[PDB]
């Protein structure tokens, strides 16, 4: 029918209508709306700038490029995480500061539907907004869904530790996208007054970070972190970041005489060159050959003094900042298959013994950060139970998931709670039918498994059993009610308690019901073990 | 003693040149910047104000012409120039300059009428220095300004969106006019009386500016010689993304997104882009490959800043510059010059019906005649004689009418009906300065009026009495127009105003008024295209 | 606990260094940025303010020195340095830094006089890190600031127009002064009491800054050591365009226009410009061919921003804020250093009047003397007697007077006549830190006063009590001047002001007042050149 034409600050955008089985009002979908000026040339390694306005009508009907990244890794993850039946193949480009909108509202009348801005995960190295289709969630819960993109890897996080290149460019991209939503979402029938930010993994961590950043203040009113927070150490760079910067510059064929000299040279480099450098660094890949403490898993969030004035641990300790309803959750087996798979973890055996276990835990230093002097104690506290080598492996993946997501999430959850703001938690346990063929059937609640329920995968992909369909229906109700009231609860849905002193949380799965003291035992074990 | 003048951005030093018999010397200034050199980041972006210089800027040397095909550019400068010897020119992206020729007495105050010249060249080649305004300045006592603008890739690359809207060259023309309004007074010129005029692409430019709201108060009269906004070859209609992409690919750039192409194209050296230009083989009749997919030019587009609609839609709205406008054409626009420059296959010097239709199709990029209408067209023009030589000449008539004759007249009529003063002419004469390679039978070839308009007879050699007179007349007709938005004057054949009677001036050895210019042709084509 | 100071742009962290005989440690801050790195498009453009930093910048490591001949640079550093062992430096275009040495107790509120040092090196080489301000700071309780500024092509390339005015290094010097005004208070200094001083090109810089309306309020006292704005070699007169083109071609650039050259040179890499720098042989003397065509060393030009006209025209103009100015020279300015570093053909040890005139002519790029005047010049100095050996020395006194002696006095007199406190001196002493390859007969060689000024006798070893007392006295005089505009004080021989009696101080083992410095020489030359 007559295509939707929304008028924005920078110009008119033409999208398209797409109907979803069971909904009369078709959803207006806008693809590739620029929220900032392409970070090309001298704009590389600098805060994002406003997009130039355009004349006539902009055709927002093609999927935007995904920010330069490992094209193979990128696609692999996209296929593994997409909620649509046909994974969209994406093109690489530094000109990737776009966002996609899905509005279930009737643009012929004025609406103020709650807005949900999704920040994709990908270890801040890969990923894209197009991987996530917001059609189902928009129609079902009558909410405006916005998936956004931000610079990754070298382009979005290169830091020199100083003012010549603070870092966190990707994070600034995220904040810029949030301002754009403030200034334009009303045109798409959304209520700028109710913007909810939510993300998974690195996206969860980004959400966790904005919640702690003054720059993001008043840009959102509710937040959701799925399998990822600011205390998930692997994504936050503590200490002097100068060494990493130099290594990158050297690998790219640049002198390190000074900071400005390094940045100037990296700006002259072409995209293909910075990509080749990215590939040489072997990011997102477990480094077995070489000292574990020097291994650099990725380029991430730093304490730039602009976005983050100090460390997350210190930031969440304060109690004099703008608070918002925050939902933090994790999956049953955050390290059951997906992550170990992508990083090429040495587990082609199926079993593991105490001795070898202490070996991987050390090699995994860049992800867990457990001192070689604590390794023995840690590994024992987990594998000292059974003599079974197979059950040991399972407890090992438990060990890592807790350090990476479990404990960091509960702690963040607690502090937010002790800060006087509504806090909610959940533990997702369910093996989706859209899992990989290589993923063992015994893995339930793997990293990313909740994505399919959150983005209504059952209503776009085939095979979903009636059970899986309802699960997704329930999940979207919670997320959408949360977006609406800052409380997930609603009639016809299992009661979800607040994460107060009793530490109540919601176990989401075949059997969704409330529980208590999530990871209580582990938070204490690690809080002590780490305290050295 | 060297004339010096205070401009908005600093003092400039020029030179005095006297023309035969004239006591009052013409103060000439060559290579005055009117914009910041469009280099690096500034490429494919709107012209920017020039930076002021501290002391006295020496303006006594000719500026480089905008990057273009060195060969074609020189050839055209030689065929169109009106000075004795053609001057060698340098190429550069640093070409945003304008030359001034003022007959005024810079010591006292003057407000002579200003005439700004926009050279032609298909928007691909050309230069201001090609035209010496000495004769016209002295003879008609007007200040003559010749301006340059970005050409080809540099001045017209468009991604069809905000990353590279296009019409950079037209923006340069505007900036140049802007500069005249702020400085011309210092050169003895009256900024309140500015006439823009040019031929061919420069004629189309004048036409485009006459429809653009950006040039609102930048000129007061307009003259388009052999070229208007309706010469379809110069104005790209529809989506231009395809040609943008072809250019990027030819230059070794990815076409991922507009921003990607633009950025890549900016990282290219002037020389790589010129090489890309040479690769594209513009301004040449492409006899191989589908005619519908050949871009002989990179022209004007509907950018949304300079032009908000197509020139057609802009005429209808009777929404444009209601200033005195003079539109004229020459007897044989496709006489020799253009087909000669485009390597048209007419060696035999004859032409039968079939070959005519076949050639007309290949000429698609120039006339846009649907393959299904080619026969009616060829029949209407050629089915009248069995003389293969006449068919061949009638074929050049047809191309001429589609490119200039018809387009020009429709423009005049619309300009007329909008209530603004309008005038038309048809120049028919063979300048003695024509290239020796051009047959002596070609009368009123493309650009043939240039020699009268710029006083070639007074700077070059060999002009007969008849020719000398012709130039005097044309220059006066032109200068009078700049003064009153009316060409008439004492001692000049009467030029009726192009009103509903459609009176126009037939300029030549014998100059006399006539009516209904290309009237029947306009009717035929309007109908043929209505299908 | 290390020194942490807060400045407008952010917090800096230094280190304490104790000096023998002073309880309060001196806080030293190395490599604080006073401008934004002049890289990429910022090349050949005035310095821009540095960007603020978010935490505590570590300022405890020497900064790189502006790109220059690494060999000449290191050499001149070793020869001039006042510290025990010369510090090896790195080359970088990112060199706009300054070092601070404050003796003030930063936990208190001190406001001591500030002395900003501008090193020399023909504007081609040199570094701030060469001069350790420890001794001077502690001994005279003043804050010492050693600054850096762009050198060679980077700091002085000029097209003679607005596309690259030039004087970039001078604009850096001014920007360093601006920085000092906005931040020095947090280092214990009094922003209202800033004295700029330097030697050679650094002296010429001080001299230039004193005439520039750009620094009319950034300092309160000036000291030019062996070098003023009248030392022709460093200041350019006439069209500079040729030099620009010669540099552009040596770098492999087109020369179509100014913008073209500047644009192309901005695309060059630091190494490429360094390769170009070396190819030019800037500080060496050419013995072959016509001397007038010798490489005109890069230098100060009349840009129209820093200097509105030649220095000789600004001093008579009496147009420049009046501040106390101290101009001084050394006994044998062309004694050994400058010649040795320029590879002068004097290995002979003797010189007749024939080779002298030949050599003098060959010295045109330095002394700038007409060929028809060479005989007089020679005859006047060497004609005295025979003894070719005694003549080479009279030849050296010749060069010295033309480069520093005459210019200095002239400048002093003009300053004095401008009704401003003026002081002159002649340094005649041979530091024990002299090079081993320096003749024992050379006393008061170029750069010899630096060792007393920067208290070398308290950093290097072996200073005799006489040399120590000389250093104590010079520092006393300098600091006294920095805080009163008058060098005199308790425990010091009287230094008369340079009034009409032209009284100046003779500093050395024996320090006493004298009169009419180079008076006869200034007469001979002012005259000889008049012809
Ligand atoms: C008319 C048109 O194709 N618009 C498209 C633009 C252009 O492709 C870019 O601006 C490059 O020109 O942006 C998208 O491709 C994108 O980035 O997702 C989507 C949109 O459909
Ligand atoms: C002093 C001087 O030569 N000015 C001239 C400049 C320079 O030649 C270029 O900018 C290269 O510096 O530009 C012109 O040549 C030009 O292109 O029209 C004309 C002008 O008279
Ligand atoms: C917080 N993240 C966790 C551990 C560190 C970081 C990267 C990893 O990434 C993912 O799960 C992504 O989904 C991904 C990235 C790259 C390739 C494949 C998959 C998961
Ligand atoms: C084909 N697989 C081999 C043997 C059976 C099956 C599961 C096992 O994987 C794991 O325990 C981890 O889940 C893992 C580690 C590394 C890569 C992929 C998956 C490794
Ligand atoms: C409006 N223009 C007419 C027809 C289309 C366009 C190009 C052509 O150009 C010329 O006559 C130029 O004068 C030229 C260009 C290239 C080479 C030689 C001469 C004449
Ligand atoms: C016998 N002819 C002469 C020499 C070869 C052949 C074609 C040429 O004509 C052209 O190049 C022009 O295309 C032209 C000019 C004038 C009339 C007709 C055609 C003129
Ligand atoms: C007024 N100066 C004199 C003559 C021109 C100018 C530079 C020269 O050199 C020096 O002062 C340095 O001592 C130096 C720098 C670079 C190379 C060699 C020597 C001495
Ligand atoms: C390589 N040089 C040769 C032999 C050793 C050294 C000094 C000498 O120098 C001269 O004759 C100079 O003319 C001079 C230099 C320093 C002071 C006075 C005179 C000539
Ligand atoms: C927008 O782009 C799509 C796909 O590129 C195309 O099919 C559609 O026609 C365009 N919209 C219009 C009508 O301009
Ligand atoms: C400052 O830099 C110096 C030398 O680079 C280094 O030794 C010192 O540890 C640094 N100080 C701090 C604490 O950053
Ligand atoms: C133009 O005049 C300037 C200043 O007199 C001079 O430098 C330059 O050489 C002159 N150019 C010509 C055309 O001779
Ligand atoms: Cl992630």
The 3-state secondary structure of C165-213, one letter per residue: CCCHHHHHHHHHHHHHHHHHHHHCEEEEEEEEEEECHHHHHHHHHHHCC
| DSSP conformational letter for A403 | I
In angstroms, the CA A83 to CA A90 distance is: 15
Do β-strands B97-102 and B26-33 pair in parallel, antiparallel, or remain unpaired? Answer: antiparallel
CB of residue C58 inside a 6 A radius of ligand 10: yes
Q: For B373-427, give the secondary structure using H, E and C.
A: CHHHHHHHHHCCCCCHHHHHHHHHHHHHHHHHHHHHHHHHHHHHHCCCCEEEEEE
In angstroms, the CA C462 to CA C446 distance is: 22
Pull the structure tokens for residue A85: 């039946």
**Residue nearest to ligand 10 atom 11, measured at CA:** C58
Angle between the C374-381 and C519-530 helix axes, to the nearest 10 degrees? 160
CA-based torsion, A207, A213, A217, A219: positive or negative: negative
CA-based torsion, B1, B6, B10, B15: positive or negative: negative
Ligand 5 centroid vs B342 CA: distance in angstroms? 8
User: What is the greatest pairwise CA distance in chain C?
Assistant: 70
With CA atoms as reference, report the closest residue to B96 among B22, B27, B46, B131. Answer: B46
The beta strands (E) that lie in C40-155 are given as: 56-58, 65-66, 91-92, 97-102, 112-118, 143-147
Residue recorded with tokens 């959701």: A224
Are B162 and A95 an interchain contact pair (Cβ–Cβ within 8 Å)?
A: no
**Residue nearest to ligand 6 atom 5, measured at CA:** B347
| CA distances (Å), origin A397, targets A1, A225, A235, C258 | 51, 21, 19, 67
Pull the structure tokens for residue A23: 């909904």
Partners of residue B271 in chain C, C-beta under 8 Å: none
User: Which of ligand 9's atoms lies nearest the C-alpha of A59?
Assistant: 1
In angstroms, the CA B365 to CA C86 distance is: 73
Length of chain C: 531
Are A52 and B165 an interchain contact pair (Cβ–Cβ within 8 Å)?
A: no
Residue C10 in 3-state DSSP? Answer: strand
Show contacts of A350-353: CB within 8 Å, 24+ apart: A350/A390, A350/A393, A351/A389, A351/A390, A351/A392, A351/A393, A352/A383, A352/A389, A352/A392, A352/A393, A352/A396, A353/A389, A353/A392
Which strands sit side by side in the sheet containing B189-199, from one edge to the other? B15-17, B26-33, B97-102, B143-147, B112-118, B189-199, B221-225, B325-330, B422-428, B503-508, B512-515
Residues with CB under 6 A from ligand 5: B 72, 75-76, 120-122, 124-125, 200-201, 204, 227, 231, 233-234, 283, 337-338, 341, 403, 446
Minimal Cβ distance to C162: which of B39, B52, B92 = B52
With CA atoms as reference, report the closest residue to C513 among C522, C502, C523. Answer: C502
Q: Is B252 left (phi over 0), alpha (psi -120 to 50) or beta?
A: left
| DSSP conformational letter for C62 | P
* Segment holding A101, helix H or strand E: strand A98-103
With CA atoms as reference, report the closest residue to B165 among B156, B176, B173, B174. Answer: B156
DSSP secondary structure string for all residues of B223-280: EEES--TT-TTTB--S--HHHHHHHHHHTT---SSHHHHHHHHHHS-HHHHHHHHHHH
The burial class, CB within 10 Å (0-12 / 13-18 / 19+), for A24 is: exposed
Q: How far is C92 from chain B (nearest CA, A)?
A: 24
Q: Which fold would CATH assign to domain B1-531? A: Rossmann fold (3.40.50)
User: Which of ligand 5's atoms lies nearest the C-alpha of B226?
Assistant: 1
Residue recorded with tokens 């080359």: C91
Pull the structure tokens for residue A151: 């610079």
Which strands sit side by side in the sheet containing A513-516, from one edge to the other? A16-18, A27-34, A98-103, A144-148, A113-119, A190-200, A222-226, A326-331, A423-429, A504-509, A513-516
With CA atoms as reference, report the closest residue to C183 among C116, C249, C250. Answer: C116
With beta carbons less than 8 A apart as the criterion, state whether A451 and A201 touch: no
HSE-CB at A256 with a 13 A cutoff on CA atoms is: 12
CB of residue A59 inside a 6 A radius of ligand 9: yes
With beta carbons less than 8 A apart as the criterion, state whether C199 and C450 touch: yes
With CA atoms as reference, report the closest residue to A341 among A292, A285, A390. Answer: A285
Chains interfacing with B (3 or more CB pairs < 8 Å) = A, C
Do β-strands B422-428 and A5-8 pair in parallel, antiparallel, or remain unpaired? Answer: unpaired
In angstroms, the CA A160 to CA A248 distance is: 10
Residue recorded with tokens 């533990």: A427
Interface of C with A (CB under 8 A): 10, 37, 39-41, 51-55, 57, 64, 90, 92-94
Q: Which residues of B are catalytic?
A: 200, 333, 446
Instruction: Write the class of the CATH domain A1-532.
Output: alpha beta
| Residue in A with minimal Cα distance to B164 | A54
Residue C55 in 3-state DSSP? Answer: coil
The beta strands (E) that lie in B54-124 are given as: 56-58, 65-66, 91-92, 97-102, 112-118
Close Cβ partners of B105 (under 8 Å, ≥ 6 residues apart): B24, B188
Catalytic residue among A141, A205, A334, A498, which? A334
| CA distances (Å), origin B265, targets A41, B122, B220, C531 | 12, 22, 37, 59
Q: How far is C313 from chain B (nearest CA, A)?
A: 16
In angstroms, the CA A126 to CA B346 distance is: 60
In angstroms, the CA A129 to CA C88 distance is: 52
- The CB density around residue A477, as the number of other CB atoms within 10 Å, is 18
**Residue nearest to ligand 2 atom 1, measured at CA:** B58
**Residue nearest to ligand 1 atom 2, measured at CA:** A59
Which value, to the nearest 10 degrees, does the dihedral of the CA atoms of residues A273, A276, A277, A283 take? 150
Are A258 and C94 an interchain contact pair (Cβ–Cβ within 8 Å)?
A: yes
Pull the structure tokens for residue C507: 């500093």
CA-based torsion, C382, C388, C390, C392: positive or negative: positive
* Segment holding A31, helix H or strand E: strand A27-34
Residue recorded with tokens 């208590």: A516
With beta carbons less than 8 A apart as the criterion, state whether C408 and C386 touch: no
Pull the structure tokens for residue A16: 């398209």
In angstroms, the CA C201 to CA C220 distance is: 20
Residues with CB under 6 A from ligand 8: C 335-336, 346-347, 349, 392, 396, 439, 442
With CA atoms as reference, report the closest residue to A82 among A127, A47, A33. Answer: A127
User: Which of ligand 3's atoms lies nearest the C-alpha of A76?
Assistant: 18
In angstroms, the CA A80 to CA A200 distance is: 14
| DSSP conformational letter for A269 | S
Residue C265 in 3-state DSSP? Answer: helix
In angstroms, the CA C414 to CA C312 distance is: 10
Are B263 and A40 an interchain contact pair (Cβ–Cβ within 8 Å)?
A: yes
With CA atoms as reference, report the closest residue to A22 among A139, A117, A105, A107. Answer: A139
Residue B205 in 3-state DSSP? Answer: helix
Phi, psi of A93 (to 5 degrees): -175, 145
Are B256 and A52 an interchain contact pair (Cβ–Cβ within 8 Å)?
A: no
Pull the structure tokens for residue A518: 């999530």
Phi, psi of C143 (to 5 degrees): -90, 125
Do β-strands B91-92 and B112-118 pair in parallel, antiparallel, or remain unpaired? Answer: unpaired
- The CB density around residue C41, as the number of other CB atoms within 10 Å, is 12
Pull the structure tokens for residue A52: 């130039």
Close Cβ partners of C75 (under 8 Å, ≥ 6 residues apart): C341
| DSSP conformational letter for A186 | G
Helices then strands, each counted (H, E), chain A: 18, 16
With beta carbons less than 8 A apart as the criterion, state whether A505 and A425 touch: yes
Close Cβ partners of C88 (under 8 Å, ≥ 6 residues apart): C74
With beta carbons less than 8 A apart as the criterion, state whether B188 and B106 touch: yes
With beta carbons less than 8 A apart as the criterion, state whether C505 and C427 touch: no
Are C39 and A261 an interchain contact pair (Cβ–Cβ within 8 Å)?
A: yes
Residue B94 in 3-state DSSP? Answer: coil
User: Which of ligand 6's atoms lies nearest the C-alpha of B346?
Assistant: 7
Q: How far is C183 from chain A (nearest CA, A)?
A: 19
Pull the structure tokens for residue B302: 């509907």
| CA distances (Å), origin A485, targets A208, A324, A415, A454, C311 | 19, 11, 21, 18, 75
| Residue in B with minimal Cα distance to A66 | B256
With CA atoms as reference, report the closest residue to B424 among B414, B409, B403. Answer: B409
With beta carbons less than 8 A apart as the criterion, state whether A353 and A332 touch: no
Are A41 and B263 an interchain contact pair (Cβ–Cβ within 8 Å)?
A: yes
Ligand 8 centroid vs C79 CA: distance in angstroms? 17
Mutate to test the interface with A, among B257, B303, B304, B310 (most CBs of A within 10 A): B257
Opening angle at CA A313, ends A311 and A315, nearest 5: 65
Pull the structure tokens for residue B353: 């019906």
* Segment holding A429, helix H or strand E: strand A423-429
Residue recorded with tokens 């990493």: A244
In angstroms, the CA A183 to CA A8 distance is: 8
With beta carbons less than 8 A apart as the criterion, state whether A190 and A198 touch: no
Mutate to test the interface with A, among B44, B253, B256 (most CBs of A within 10 A): B256
Residue recorded with tokens 């007897």: B331
Length of chain B: 531
Length of chain A: 532
In angstroms, the CA A426 to CA A440 distance is: 24
Partners of residue C92 in chain A, C-beta under 8 Å: 257-258, 261
With beta carbons less than 8 A apart as the criterion, state whether B381 and B395 touch: yes
**Residue nearest to ligand 4 atom 17, measured at CA:** A341
With beta carbons less than 8 A apart as the criterion, state whether C146 and C99 touch: yes
User: What is the greatest pairwise CA distance in chain B?
Assistant: 71
* A201 part of the active site: yes
Pull the structure tokens for residue A268: 């002259």
In angstroms, the CA C296 to CA C158 distance is: 12
End-to-end CA distance of chain A: 65
| CA distances (Å), origin B311, targets B196, B258, B301, B318, B414 | 18, 25, 10, 11, 11
In angstroms, the CA A136 to CA A495 distance is: 24
Mutate to test the interface with B, among A56, A59, A60, A64 (most CBs of B within 10 A): A56
**Nearest ligand atom owner, CA of A350:** 4
Residue recorded with tokens 């298959």: A337
| Residue in C with minimal Cα distance to B42 | C263
In angstroms, the CA A453 to CA A45 distance is: 36
Partners of residue A60 in chain B, C-beta under 8 Å: none
Partners of residue B55 in chain C, C-beta under 8 Å: 304
With beta carbons less than 8 A apart as the criterion, state whether C342 and C283 touch: yes
In angstroms, the CA A13 to CA A60 distance is: 6
Close Cβ partners of A275 (under 8 Å, ≥ 6 residues apart): A68, A92
| CA distances (Å), origin C458, targets C19, C116, C448, C452, C461 | 9, 20, 16, 10, 7
Across the strands, what pairs with A328? A225, A425
In angstroms, the CA B21 to CA A111 distance is: 80
In angstroms, the CA B314 to CA B208 distance is: 10
With beta carbons less than 8 A apart as the criterion, state whether A178 and A219 touch: yes
Partners of residue A11 in chain B, C-beta under 8 Å: 162
In angstroms, the CA B330 to CA B516 distance is: 15
Interface of B with A (CB under 8 A): 41, 161-163, 165, 256-257, 259-260, 263, 266, 303-305, 308
Which strands sit side by side in the sheet containing A57-59, from one edge to the other? A5-8, A11-14, A57-59
Catalytic residue among C446, C449, C471, C521, which? C446
CA-based torsion, B303, B307, B311, B317: positive or negative: positive
In angstroms, the CA A151 to CA A122 distance is: 12
In angstroms, the CA A377 to CA A384 distance is: 10
Pull the structure tokens for residue A398: 């438990």
Interface of A with C (CB under 8 A): 42, 162-164, 166, 257-258, 260-261, 264, 267, 304-306
In angstroms, the CA A422 to CA A489 distance is: 13
Method by which this entry was solved: X-ray
**Resolution rounded to one decimal, in angstroms:** 2.8
């Amino acid at each position: 029918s007559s295509p939707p034409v929304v008028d924005t600050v920078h110009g008119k955008v033409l999208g398209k209508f797409v109907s979803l089985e069971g909904f009369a009002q078709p959803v207006a979908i806008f693809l590739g709306i620029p929220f900032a000026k392409p970070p090309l040339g001298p704009l590389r390694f600098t805060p994002p700038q406003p997009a130039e306005p355009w004349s006539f009508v902009k055709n927002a009907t093609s999927y935007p490029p995904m920010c330069t990244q490992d094209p193979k890794a990128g696609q692999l993850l996209s296929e593994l995480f997409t909620n649509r039946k046909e994974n969209i193949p994406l093109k690489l480009s530094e000109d990737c500061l776009y966002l996609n909108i899905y509005t279930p509202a009737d643009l012929t009348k004025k609406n103020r539907l709650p807005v949900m801005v999704w920040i994709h995960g990908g270890g801040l190295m890969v990923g894209a907004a197009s991987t996530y289709d917001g059609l189902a969630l928009a129609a079902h819960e009558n909410v405006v869904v916005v998936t956004i993109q931000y610079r990754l890897g070298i382009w979005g996080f290169f830091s020199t530790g100083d003012e010549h290149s603070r870092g966190n460019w990707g994070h600034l991209d995220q904040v810029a996208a949030l301002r754009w939503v403030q200034d334009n979402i009303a045109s798409f029938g959304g209520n700028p007054g109710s913007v909810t930010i939510f993300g998974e993994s690195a996206g969860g961590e980004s959400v966790s970070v904005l919640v702690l950043s003054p720059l993001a203040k008043n840009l959102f009113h509710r937040a959701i972190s799925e399998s990822g927070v600011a205390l998930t150490s692997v994504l936050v760079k503590k200490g002097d970041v100068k060494p990493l910067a130099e290594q990158i510059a050297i690998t790219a064929g640049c002198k390190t005489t000074t900071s400005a000299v390094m940045v100037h040279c990296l700006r002259q480099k072409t995209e293909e060159e910075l990509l080749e450098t990215t590939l040489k660094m072997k990011f997102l890949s477990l480094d077995l050959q070489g000292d574990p403490r020097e291994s650099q898993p990725l380029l991430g969030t730093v304490i730039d003094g602009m976005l983050l004035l100090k460390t997350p641990e210190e930031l969440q300790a304060e109690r004099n900042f703008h608070t918002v309803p925050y939902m933090v959750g994790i999956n049953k087996q955050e390290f059951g298959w997906l992550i170990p798979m992508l990083m090429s973890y040495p587990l082609s055996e199926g079993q593991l013994d105490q001795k070898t276990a202490m070996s991987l835990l050390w090699k995994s230093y860049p992800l867990v950060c457990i001192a070689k002097e604590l390794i023995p104690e840690a590994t024992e506290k987990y594998l000292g139970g059974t003599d079974d080598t197979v059950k040991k492996k399972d407890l090992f993946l438990d060990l890592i998931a807790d350090v990476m997501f479990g404990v960091p999430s509960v702690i963040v959850a607690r502090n937010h709670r002790d800060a006087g703001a509504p806090t909610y938690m959940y533990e997702f346990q369910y093996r989706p039918s859209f899992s990989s063929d290589m993923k063992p059937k015994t893995v339930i609640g793997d990293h990313g498994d909740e994505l399919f329920s959150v983005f209504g995968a059952p209503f776009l992909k085939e095979g979903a059993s009636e059970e899986e369909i309802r699960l997704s229906k329930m999940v979207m109700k919670f997320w959408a009610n949360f977006a609406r009231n800052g409380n997930p609860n609603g009639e016809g849905l299992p009661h979800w308690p607040e994460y107060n002193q009793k530490e109540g949380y919601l176990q989401i799965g075949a059997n969704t019901q409330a529980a208590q003291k999530l990871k209580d035992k582990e938070v204490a074990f690690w809080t002590n073990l780490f305290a050295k």
